[PDB]
Ligand binder design. Structure first.
Ligand code: HEM
Ligand code: HEM
Lengths: 137, 137
């Protein structure tokens, strides 16, 4: 279930974080414009770039921290507020996060794995509600 | 994105090149007049002809190099000049290229693979603008 998926992802967090981030960019290619250093780079070139692995891991580590602090996939409002207040997210809207989760859930459903994708969909929906209510436009 | 799509095509070039070229001749059957020996033939018949796979791979080998030497889907002028000046292209106008790109983009949109089809549409239009700049009618 969901708690197991957090363990699965954490176990190989680098690989999962990069995999899922690329899936997000491939499903919604216009989203690459928020990551100016990744424009025009192949996947292999991106994995050669220190900030690519580092920032993506750190993104999914916080994702897992928020997932683990949730109760039945409902995130803390304090965690949603962190995500809204981050300088790196100042020009985001809830639509950016809805896209990420659509891609995340599609990735889980396509994998050789046994993720509880329905719960990740619900967590995404609940986090999007909490972002909007913490003031994300 | 675009850069990764070049690597994806290159990973199974023969198949993608023949798939896309066939999509082009089937959408635009009129275009067979520019070629020798292709009229009167089903897809599987073309695929078994001595020269079909080889020439289509040569076309897409170079198209991938032109895509790869581009910056932000804008091809090099010297690559455009090459294409305009090739003797094999002496009877072409930019409309032939526009039709190829229409078919390429529709093929990507229909495929199971996650191509950045909007980027290929931009690349096709930048390439036709570059052909015109290089003097193709
Ligand atoms: C639950 C979802 C998200 C979490 C937990 C998260 C977390 C993080 C973290 C920890 C950082 C700092 C990383 C460094 O190192 C970061 C930076 C950043 N995030 Fe997010 N983020 C999320 C969603 C998104 C989305 C949906 C977008 C855009 C579509 C986005 C765009 C960015 C950008 C542009 C930066 C700064 C530049 C960079 O690190 O490459 N984030 N985020
Ligand atoms: C970016 C687009 C294109 C590229 C990179 C390209 C490249 C090439 C190359 C590399 C060859 C030589 C193949 C060989 O030596 O075996 C070739 C030949 C040829 N091209 Fe193009 N070409 C392009 C577009 C077109 C289009 C749109 C047409 C007509 C609709 C066309 C018509 C021909 C013809 C008639 C030949 C010689 C006959 C043949 O190979 O069957 N090309 N092209």
């Amino acid at each position: 279930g969901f708690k197991q998926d957090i363990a699965t992802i954490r176990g190989d967090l680098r690989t999962y974080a990069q995999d899922i981030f690329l899936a997000f960019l491939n499903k919604y290619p216009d989203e690459r414009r928020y990551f100016k250093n990744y424009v025009g780079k192949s996947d292999q070139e991106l994995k050669s770039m220190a900030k690519f692995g580092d920032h993506t891991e750190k993104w999914f580590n916080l994702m897992m921290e928020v997932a683990d602090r949730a109760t039945d996939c409902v995130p803390l409002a304090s965690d949603a507020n962190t995500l809204v207040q981050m300088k790196q997210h100042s020009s985001l809207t809830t639509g950016n996060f809805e896209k990420l989760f659509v891609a995340l859930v599609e990735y889980m459903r396509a994998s050789g794995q046994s993720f509880d994708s329905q719960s990740w969909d619900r967590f995404g929906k609940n986090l999007v509600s909490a972002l909007s209510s913490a003031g994300m436009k």
